[PDB]
Write a protein that binds this ligand. Structure first.
Ligand SMILES: *[C@@H]1O[C@H](CO)[C@@H](O[C@@H]2O[C@H](CO)[C@@H](O[C@@H]3O[C@H](CO[C@H]4O[C@H](CO)[C@@H](O)[C@H](O)[C@@H]4O)[C@@H](O)[C@H](O[C@H]4O[C@H](CO)[C@@H](O)[C@H](O)[C@@H]4O)[C@@H]3O)[C@H](O)[C@H]2NC(C)=O)[C@H](O)[C@H]1NC(C)=O
Ligand SMILES: *[C@@H]1O[C@H](CO)[C@@H](O[C@@H]2O[C@H](CO)[C@@H](O[C@@H]3O[C@H](CO[C@H]4O[C@H](CO)[C@@H](O)[C@H](O)[C@@H]4O)[C@@H](O)[C@H](O[C@H]4O[C@H](CO)[C@@H](O)[C@H](O)[C@@H]4O)[C@@H]3O)[C@H](O)[C@H]2NC(C)=O)[C@H](O)[C@H]1NC(C)=O
Ligand SMILES: *[C@@H]1O[C@H](CO)[C@@H](O[C@@H]2O[C@H](CO)[C@@H](O[C@@H]3O[C@H](CO)[C@@H](O)[C@H](O[C@H]4O[C@H](CO)[C@@H](O)[C@H](O)[C@@H]4O)[C@@H]3O)[C@H](O)[C@H]2NC(C)=O)[C@H](O)[C@H]1NC(C)=O
Ligand SMILES: NC(=O)[C@H](Cc1ccccc1)NC(=O)[C@H](CC(c1ccccc1)c1ccccc1)CP(=O)(O)[C@@H](N)CCc1ccccc1
Ligand SMILES: *[C@@H]1O[C@H](CO)[C@@H](O[C@@H]2O[C@H](CO)[C@@H](O[C@@H]3O[C@H](CO)[C@@H](O)[C@H](O)[C@@H]3O)[C@H](O)[C@H]2NC(C)=O)[C@H](O)[C@H]1NC(C)=O
Ligand SMILES: *[C@@H]1O[C@H](CO)[C@@H](O[C@@H]2O[C@H](CO)[C@@H](O[C@@H]3O[C@H](CO)[C@@H](O)[C@H](O)[C@@H]3O)[C@H](O)[C@H]2NC(C)=O)[C@H](O)[C@H]1NC(C)=O
Ligand SMILES: *[C@@H]1O[C@H](CO)[C@@H](O[C@@H]2O[C@H](CO)[C@@H](O[C@@H]3O[C@H](CO)[C@@H](O)[C@H](O)[C@@H]3O)[C@H](O)[C@H]2NC(C)=O)[C@H](O)[C@H]1NC(C)=O
Ligand SMILES: *[C@@H]1O[C@H](CO)[C@@H](O[C@@H]2O[C@H](CO)[C@@H](O)[C@H](O)[C@H]2NC(C)=O)[C@H](O)[C@H]1NC(C)=O
Ligand SMILES: *[C@@H]1O[C@H](CO)[C@@H](O[C@@H]2O[C@H](CO)[C@@H](O)[C@H](O)[C@H]2NC(C)=O)[C@H](O)[C@H]1NC(C)=O
Ligand SMILES: *[C@@H]1O[C@H](CO)[C@@H](O[C@@H]2O[C@H](CO)[C@@H](O)[C@H](O)[C@H]2NC(C)=O)[C@H](O)[C@H]1NC(C)=O
Ligand SMILES: *[C@@H]1O[C@H](CO)[C@@H](O[C@@H]2O[C@H](CO)[C@@H](O)[C@H](O)[C@H]2NC(C)=O)[C@H](O)[C@H]1NC(C)=O
Ligand SMILES: *[C@@H]1O[C@H](CO)[C@@H](O)[C@H](O)[C@H]1NC(C)=O
Ligand SMILES: *[C@@H]1O[C@H](CO)[C@@H](O)[C@H](O)[C@H]1NC(C)=O
Ligand SMILES: *[C@@H]1O[C@H](CO)[C@@H](O)[C@H](O)[C@H]1NC(C)=O
Ligand SMILES: *[C@@H]1O[C@H](CO)[C@@H](O)[C@H](O)[C@H]1NC(C)=O
Ligand SMILES: [Br-]
Ligand SMILES: [Br-]
Ligand SMILES: [Br-]
Ligand SMILES: [Br-]
Ligand SMILES: [Br-]
Ligand SMILES: [Br-]
Ligand SMILES: [Br-]
Ligand SMILES: [Br-]
Ligand SMILES: [Br-]
Ligand SMILES: [Br-]
Ligand SMILES: [Br-]
Ligand SMILES: [Br-]
Ligand SMILES: [Br-]
Ligand SMILES: [Zn+2]
Length: 870
């Protein structure tokens, strides 16, 4: 490319840093263009002739350069290097160390039609009037497409934003609006206060018609914004935000430093949310809430995501990673605080179940060979994007969970408060976090050397346990399936002596192996309590047998988390090969006596995975026998379920999980009950309320008919609750009619009836069942370039689409097909982690069948199929 561009690396030089930006913009939402002026106050730290900077998609009309002393307005030369998104201003005289200069760039651009950058869209009223909207989504690398800037997290500065807007529209930004000035035509010029020192990826602005619901919290004005038709649905978000804000301010011991806090429901938005200082943005479906149209799950989603964005105000905004290799310092911490804060002041939501489920999934991902270390180098935009995955979020927060469990809660909070004070308005890398722990630790434990392997090595240990009399023999090794270094592991363990008293302790495995002294003789022992540790445990056969026998005798000597753990671990170990798959089904035979959600949903997960693998291979009979077996196992919990909203949140989640399992596979007469409810709902023009906990199920069953499908579509394009629309959309995309499934995907990719923000979800849903299995993948291939135009390589959305439409493939023939497809895209695309993980998941699918197919075929030989065999 550009050997004639005065910079080669992807990280900007350190020679010049920005102090202040004054950015004034004139967006035209109608024509979808904008004109701009950016003034950048910089300082040189070394002698240099070049200012290297970021800019993309900018038609640059004038570039002036002012020596601060000299105050005369020069012209300066400009070079471009599109590959790295970089531009270079070559200076008339050399920049001297410690001198100040002002850089002014005038330019015009397009308002983006993706979800990335400064983007804009139109939506439709209840009034059937067309409305326009513009919003920013900059993280990680899009700020540079709205304005020239030093677009790297470590270059923090202050921003003065100016927006020209039509009088009817409201403009928002990070800071409070300082003033307005009326302009010719129906135009207003807005000016926002100078911001605090922050990263460019956090700059945000919004132009559109909105209303607000507000409340004072001790000098901070908290406001929820939404389009006027929706403003009735923001009361729960406001009440929640106020609670979590007080909580976080008490815990961190550092006040939120802005005079305003805005939370905005954006009509069209790809992420779940974004933490821009003072102007947090959300999908409508993740911030709006109505008790009568939104399920329990929907309420949890809104509480969780608000906790998450609020936590970012400290971890991410106040304190920020130096570079994307340490993204987990943001996202791990924010995820940890999300689930921590809910357990403190929303304990009734049982959000710990979600945390637990997400970790199960992150481990399966982490166990692959195409995993990276959680802190790993990123040297391209694709790798930067790829950091936004479940490792950085859920492994990062489970590292912290391990650490908090092992030290104390108070020792943890002390470390945290030191950390945020010491690095306020500044940048960090992994070592600073361990340093802050070391200061509180009293060098009793060297936390830096304890966390070394956890942060720099991929994967996690398999811990093997064998009871030799009154002592546990213990080993660690890399967990992975084939086709290094030691962890410092906090081994917790709980146990029951011969006299039925329970003892629990903690030791720390530093070496390859160790012995634990048990003090007594024990009936059973369970390692890794509540899965507070990020590893999997394998027992010797005698010791598996003891836990499996105790579950059959009285499962409640362990927690629901403990029993969920065991179910997960034994299935992942039967997949590797360390135990026969039969052993896993022995362990879940106790489920007839299980009343907690977490172990039941974890078993329902493994069952469905296996079911869906067999179904796509065409082993229909065998797959029906499998869910019949599991159905008989849970027959009593399933049959005692009511079709209501009664019970604790957790019990409400169990109802949904159980009824959904029975209706999907046509077991019992749940289908009949659901259809009766749908017909009565449909014949009442959606008036006779459906209990929010059974809607998805009822809608799925109705959508299996033309008459019902059409009627649901009619509701989707017209009702005002985005929560209900989402349950409807899931039903539509569960139709067995291929023409309809094709229409849903094509419509969403174009906008039209469904927004493109629903596309990954629609494709996910279509690819999961048999009629749409081949259709989703084909859709992804044929529209591959249009997808990448809307969602760059290799962002979260694309990795979601690739994974969700390939992970149920289990033959060599599909493996070759998927591989060949990506190799014809480009060698760069085929070498993406996204692609490599998909190829690896398929290979594992293939090995899984060749190990367990004949086993499963034998175990189920007497069970009754539901389908006729071919
Ligand atoms: C099955 O159930 C669905 C509900 O899902 C019903 O759909 C509703 O149908 C009604 C009646 O057609 C719709 O009401 C109409 O809304 C329009 C938009 O209203 C907005 O804009 C006005 C000003 O523009 C605001 O005042 C208002 O508060 C909203 O912000 C109105 O413009 C329409 O008004 C015109 O017609 C009525 C006569 O019906 C006159 O009184 C008015 O003065 C004016 O002439 C009208 O009010 C409503 O939008 C639909 N809701 C949804 C969610 O789609 C179906 O009607 C129902 N089917 C059957 C057979 O009953
Ligand atoms: C309701 O609202 C009020 C105001 O918003 C809150 O009261 C404020 O509490 C904060 C934090 O506790 C105070 O800000 C801090 O004051 C501490 C001391 O500053 C005083 O003392 C110094 C000592 O030199 C005096 O010179 C000075 O005049 C101040 O009056 C500081 O130690 C604080 O810590 C640090 O500042 C930043 C904050 O993170 C760090 O980077 C530094 O390391 C430094 O240590 C901070 O400056 C504030 O002054 C209080 N206001 C009032 C009016 O008392 C309530 O806490 C709040 N209640 C809620 C939210 O529940
Ligand atoms: C971007 O460029 C577009 C043109 O490509 C330009 O579009 C026009 O914007 C104005 C916005 O002010 C619109 O004018 C309105 O017209 C309606 C009638 O359709 C009026 O009701 C509007 O409101 C009031 O006018 C005064 C207050 O503004 C009041 O005295 C009066 O009582 C009304 O309440 C307003 O006059 C016009 O419709 C559009 N045209 C198109 C084709 O979209 C837009 O202004 C440019 N934006 C920027 C920021 O440069
Ligand atoms: N949900 C999303 O699409 C993205 C991407 C993602 C998805 C899964 C795992 C990791 C990351 N995440 C976000 O929007 C989370 C919330 C989400 C979530 C929280 C924890 C773990 C996983 C997801 C969420 C969703 C529902 C309820 C509560 C929180 C919001 P954020 O503030 O992190 C923001 N920094 C993401 C910016 C971004 C997103 C995707 C691509 C590029 C840039
Ligand atoms: C280059 O420009 C930067 C700012 O763009 C200069 O740094 C800062 O300059 C201001 C002076 O205006 C210092 O702020 C303070 O003023 C307020 C009164 O409002 C008071 O609170 C402070 O005690 C200080 O007087 C600021 O601290 C300063 N920062 C640094 C690191 O120096 C910088 O001086 C300029 N360099 C030049 C012109 O060589
Ligand atoms: C605020 O955080 C800074 C980091 O910006 C802390 O400075 C760091 O202090 C730790 C000690 O706790 C240093 O660790 C030591 O480094 C030496 C140098 O190689 C090493 O040989 C030792 O074994 C030990 O690990 C760390 O290097 C240092 N880092 C930097 C960048 O200075 C500082 O302690 C914190 N301040 C407060 C008041 O807590
Ligand atoms: C789910 O099912 C389990 C087992 O059916 C329930 O655990 C049972 O809980 C009751 C009361 O919570 C226990 O009875 C009590 O035992 C303690 C200790 O001996 C004593 O202090 C009380 O006076 C009473 O006797 C019972 O032992 C326990 N069963 C087992 C096997 O541990 C659990 O409550 C159910 N959960 C829900 C949400 O329904
Ligand atoms: C980039 O924008 C510039 C102006 O900002 C466009 O150049 C011309 O503008 C002058 C007046 O400033 C007119 O004399 C010309 O008519 C404009 N150009 C044309 C082709 O009409 C320039 O065209 C834009 N560049 C690109 C590549 O679109
Ligand atoms: C919407 O926001 C405004 C502030 O932006 C809220 O009320 C304001 O209160 C302050 C102080 O009393 C005043 O500076 C503003 O003039 C007030 N605005 C209005 C419109 O009254 C207002 O309450 C918020 N709306 C809702 C429904 O909460
Ligand atoms: C059950 O037996 C255990 C040991 O076999 C008893 O626990 C020990 O009690 C002694 C004192 O009697 C303590 O010094 C030990 O520390 C205890 N062991 C542990 C592991 O804590 C226990 O008291 C007995 N309980 C009953 C109800 O019989
Ligand atoms: C059709 O399904 C419903 C499930 O809701 C059956 O009603 C329940 O039946 C089981 C088993 O007899 C009981 O344990 C439940 O308590 C019943 N009612 C509830 C939970 O409300 C119904 O009996 C089924 N149809 C037939 C013919 O048996
Ligand atoms: C905006 O998009 C149009 C589409 O063809 C293009 O011609 C124009 O040059 C673009 N402006 C930019 C990239 O600044
Ligand atoms: C939802 O329903 C309950 C009772 O059915 C009611 O008290 C509540 O007000 C309803 N929610 C709204 C927003 O009306
Ligand atoms: C696993 O990936 C590493 C790079 O992390 C690579 O060197 C190695 O060849 C791969 N091994 C297998 C078995 O896939
Ligand atoms: C284990 O601990 C018990 C009591 O705590 C002690 O009597 C016993 O000797 C210990 N075993 C070993 C091998 O140290
Ligand atoms: Br301007
Ligand atoms: Br109107
Ligand atoms: Br972009
Ligand atoms: Br927690
Ligand atoms: Br790096
Ligand atoms: Br880059
Ligand atoms: Br522990
Ligand atoms: Br049933
Ligand atoms: Br259609
Ligand atoms: Br068509
Ligand atoms: Br599998
Ligand atoms: Br048998
Ligand atoms: Br078959
Ligand atoms: Zn986050």
């Amino acid at each position: 490319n550009g050997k004639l561009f005065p910079w080669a690396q992807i990280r900007l030089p350190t020679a010049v840093v920005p102090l202040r930006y004054e950015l004034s913009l004139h967006p035209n939402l109608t024509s979808m263009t904008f004109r701009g002026s950016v003034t950048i106050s910089v300082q040189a730290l070394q002698v240099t002739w070049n200012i290297i900077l970021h800019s993309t998609g900018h038609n640059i009309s004038r570039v002036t350069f002012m020596s601060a002393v000299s105050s005369q307005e020069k012209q300066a030369e400009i070079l471009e290097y599109a590959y790295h998104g970089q531009i270079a201003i070559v200076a008339p005289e050399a920049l001297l160390a410690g001198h100040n200069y002002t850089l002014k760039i005038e330019y015009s651009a397009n308002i983006s039609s993706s979800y990335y950058g400064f983007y804009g869209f139109s939506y439709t009223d209840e009034s059937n009037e067309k409305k326009y909207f513009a919003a920013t989504q900059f993280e990680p690398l899009a700020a540079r497409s709205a304005f020239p800037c030093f677009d790297e997290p470590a270059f923090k500065a202050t921003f003065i934003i100016k927006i020209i807007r039509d009088e009817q529209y409201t403009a928002l930004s990070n800071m409070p609006k300082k003033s307005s000035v009326v302009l010719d035509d129906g135009l207003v010029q807005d000016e926002f206060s100078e911001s605090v020192k922050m990263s460019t990826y956090l700059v945000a602005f919004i132009v559109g018609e909105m209303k607000n619901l507000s409340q004072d919290v001790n000098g901070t004005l908290v406001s929820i914004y939404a389009v006027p038709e929706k403003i009735g649905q923001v009361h729960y978000a406001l009440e929640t935000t106020v609670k979590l804000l007080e909580f976080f301010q008490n815990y961190f011991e550092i006040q939120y430093p802005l005079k305003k806090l805005d939370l905005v429901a954006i009509p069209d938005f790809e992420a779940g949310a974004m933490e821009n200082w003072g102007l947090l943005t959300f999908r409508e479906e993740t911030l709006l809430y109505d008790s009568n149209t939104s399920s329990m799950a929907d309420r949890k989603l809104v509480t969780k995501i608000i906790a998450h964005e609020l936590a970012h105000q400290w971890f991410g905004n106040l304190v920020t990673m130096k570079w994307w290799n340490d993204l987990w310092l943001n996202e791990g911490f924010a995820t940890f605080m999300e689930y921590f804060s809910l357990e403190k002041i929303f304990k009734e939501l049982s959000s710990y179940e979600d945390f637990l489920d997400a970790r199960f999934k992150t481990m399966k991902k982490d166990s692959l060979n195409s995993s990276h270390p959680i802190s790993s180098s990123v040297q391209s935009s694709e790798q930067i994007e790829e950091m936004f995955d479940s490792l950085s979020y859920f492994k990062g927060s489970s590292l912290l969970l391990m650490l908090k469990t092992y030290l104390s809660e108070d020792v943890f909070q002390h470390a945290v408060v030191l950390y945020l004070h010491n690095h306020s308005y500044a940048s960090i890398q992994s070592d600073d976090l361990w340093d802050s722990f070391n200061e509180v630790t009293n060098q009793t434990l060297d936390v830096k050397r304890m966390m070394k392997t956890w942060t720099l090595q991929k994967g996690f240990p398999l811990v093997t346990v064998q009871k030799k009399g009154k002592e546990l023999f213990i080993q660690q090794e890399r967990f992975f399936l084939n086709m290094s270094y030691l962890w410092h592991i906090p081994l917790s363990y709980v146990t029951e002596g011969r006299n039925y008293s329970k003892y629990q302790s903690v030791s720390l495995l530093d070496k390859k192996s160790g012995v634990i002294n048990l003090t007594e003789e024990v009936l059973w022992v369970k390692v890794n309590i509540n899965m507070n540790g990020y590893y999997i445990v394998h027992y010797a056969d005698d010791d598996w047998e003891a836990l499996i026998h105790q579950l059959k005798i009285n499962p409640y000597v362990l927690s629901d988390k403990d029993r969920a753990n065991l179910i997960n671990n034994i299935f992942e170990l039967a997949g590797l090969g360390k135990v026969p798959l039969k052993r896993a089904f022995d362990l879940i035979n106790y489920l007839g006596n299980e009343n907690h959600t977490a172990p039941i949903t974890e078993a329902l997960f493994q069952t469905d995975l296996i079911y869906n693998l067999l179904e796509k291979l065409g082993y229909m009979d065998l797959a029906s026998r499998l869910v019949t077996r599991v159905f008989k196992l849970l027959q009593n919990q399933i049959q005692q379920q009511t079709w209501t909203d009664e019970g604790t949140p957790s019990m409400r989640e169990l109802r949904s999980a159980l009824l959904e399992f029975a209706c999907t596979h046509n077991l019992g007469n749940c289908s009949t009950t659901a259809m009766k409810l749908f017909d009565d709902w449909m014949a009442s023009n959606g008036t006779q309320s459906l209990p929010t906990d059974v809607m998805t199920t009822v809608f799925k069953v109705g959508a299996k008919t033309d008459k019902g499908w059409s009627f649901l579509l009619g509701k989707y394009i017209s009702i005002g609750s985005e929560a209900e629309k989402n349950k409807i959309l899931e039903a539509l995309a569960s139709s067995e009619d291929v023409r309809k499934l094709y229409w849903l995907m094509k419509s969403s990719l174009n906008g039209d009836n469904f927004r493109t923000q629903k596309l990954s979800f629609i494709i996910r849903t279509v690819g999961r069942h048999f009629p749409g299995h081949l259709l989703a993948w084909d859709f992804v291939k044929e529209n591959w370039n249009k997808l990448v135009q809307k969602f760059p390589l290799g962002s979260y959305t694309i990795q979601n689409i690739v994974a969700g439409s390939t992970y149920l493939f289990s033959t060599k023939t599909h493996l070759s097909e998927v591989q060949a497809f990506f190799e014809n895209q480009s060698e760069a695309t085929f070498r993406l982690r996204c692609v490599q993980e998909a190829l690896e998941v398929i290979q594992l699918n293939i090995q899984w069948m060749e190990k367990n197919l004949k086993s499963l075929t034998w175990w189920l030989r007497t069970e009754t199929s539901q389908v006729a065999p071919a």
